[PDB]
Design a protein around this ligand. Structure first.
Ligand code: UPG
Length: 395
């Protein structure tokens, strides 16, 4: 019947946007859903009809320029452990008189896995990124995560992680606890999961995506004459590239028929870019998904969320990866023939312009984009995700 579903995430657009429509659907079907979220995102999540349950997070918030995420994986996992340790008691208290029938959580929310186990309720991981295949432990986890860190920093990380887990009655190795959920819905296109053939289907179910108007974000109107709209965005975090943005202005400025929407983040000011020609507009934040329904090209850092939205609208990409997993994703995008990967250094005005002109006229990039878009249309929709979640509800 109508149950209590509690969703858990952090204040990061890439970890909240991919599941908003699913939360909205669960509310619409009559479930009472709470959304554990840091205060800066309360409004953003309240837009789904779920009630925000607030808690203080120590992770970098996207609104504050004084903060930034690290570029390396090991520092990020450090951040997630620290945040989890201080966030768990707050969330335990907040939910002490109302324990949900099911727990939904983004991959970053360790407290949700701990509270799920201590409560005895099911937990569903919602992954806005790729998941472990069978053989992940021997192919990447041991060679690239564990074996390169037999350091005092590594040993400290594991000692604190396992002390925290064992403090909470959990005996799993920290790495299986973090990287191997018992049940997960994968919100990315199968076409972009490495070794999708070897992903345990009894654990993971690809639901691809379904995106609706984030009407809260407002709209963007195509200006008159703008035949080819190109959006430039390096995301929410790794956005401090003023030299690259100036190269974008010089690649598309005054190009007849092209219009450039340049999203520069909040650590670069428009003044840093010089005089702007009439066909280029600059923002520190854009309604990105609305612009991707109208864009002919997307110059992206290849973050998972932006890539998902672009593929969902079948817009060709120039992938300029900035940090962490983006490089791998850029490579996959190029490996699928829907994007060109450029390093930030080599992204000069002339090569940006000729790469964009090439991508938008290439019939083969369009047909591989439509194929991926149809595959995503066929891994169910939001209603299949809500069905699988409801299926995890007990009696
Ligand atoms: O002007 C803008 C800029 C971005 N977005 C949206 O913001 C979300 C971000 O998507 P994604 O590109 O996947 O996230 P990023 O900001 O690129 O990356 C983060 O992903 C990791 C998750 O913790 C961390 O390393 C840091 O947050 C950072 O790397 C997407 O839904 C975009 O549509 C907008 O709506 N308007």
């Amino acid at each position: 019947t109508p149950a209590h579903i509690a969703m858990f995430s952090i204040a990061a657009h890439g970890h909240v946007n991919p599941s908003l429509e699913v939360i909205r659907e669960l509310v619409a079907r009559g479930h009472r859903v709470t959304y554990a979220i840091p205060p800066v995102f309360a409004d953003k999540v309240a837009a789904t009809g779920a009630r925000p349950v607030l808690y203080h997070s120590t992770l970098p918030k996207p609104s504050n320029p004084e903060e930034s995420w690290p570029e390396d994986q090991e520092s990020a996992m450090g951040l997630f452990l620290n945040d989890a340790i201080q966030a768990l008691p707050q969330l335990a208290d907040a939910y002490a008189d109302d324990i949900p029938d099911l727990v939904l959580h983004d991959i970053t929310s360790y407290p949700a896995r701990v509270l799920a186990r201590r409560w005895g309720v099911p937990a569903v991981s919602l992954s806005p990124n790729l998941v472990a295949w069978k053989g992940y432990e021997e192919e990447v986890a041991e060679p690239m995560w564990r074996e390169p860190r037999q350091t005092e920093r590594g040993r400290a990380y594991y000692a604190r992680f396992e002390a925290w887990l064992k403090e909470n009655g959990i005996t799993e190795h920290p790495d299986t606890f973090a990287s191997h959920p018992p049940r997960s819905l994968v919100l990315i296109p199968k076409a972009l999961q490495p070794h999708a053939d070897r992903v345990d289907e009894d654990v993971y179910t690809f639901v691809g995506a379904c995106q609706g108007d984030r009407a809260e974000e407002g709209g963007w109107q195509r200006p008159a004459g703008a035949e080819k709209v190109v959006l430039v965005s390096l995301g929410s975090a790794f956005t401090k590239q003023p030299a690259f943005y100036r190269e974008c202005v010089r690649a598309f400025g005054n190009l007849p028929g092209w219009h450039l929407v340049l999203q520069i983040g909040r650590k670069v000011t428009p003044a840093e870019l010089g005089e702007l020609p009439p066909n280029v507009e600059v923002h520190q934040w854009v309604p990105q998904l609305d612009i991707l329904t109208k864009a002919s090209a997307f110059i992206t850092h290849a973050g998972m969320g932006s890539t998902m939205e672009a593929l969902s609208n079948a817009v060709p990409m120039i992938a300029v990866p900035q940090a962490v997993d983006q490089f791998g994703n850029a490579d996959m995008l190029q490996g699928l023939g829907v994007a060109r990967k450029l390093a930030t250094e080599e992204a000069t005005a002339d090569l940006l312009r000729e790469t964009a002109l090439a991508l938008v006229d290439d019939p083969e990039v369009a047909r591989r984009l439509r194929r991926i878009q149809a595959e995503m249309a066929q891994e169910g929709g939001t209603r299949r995700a809500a069905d699988l979640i409801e299926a995890e509800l007990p009696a």
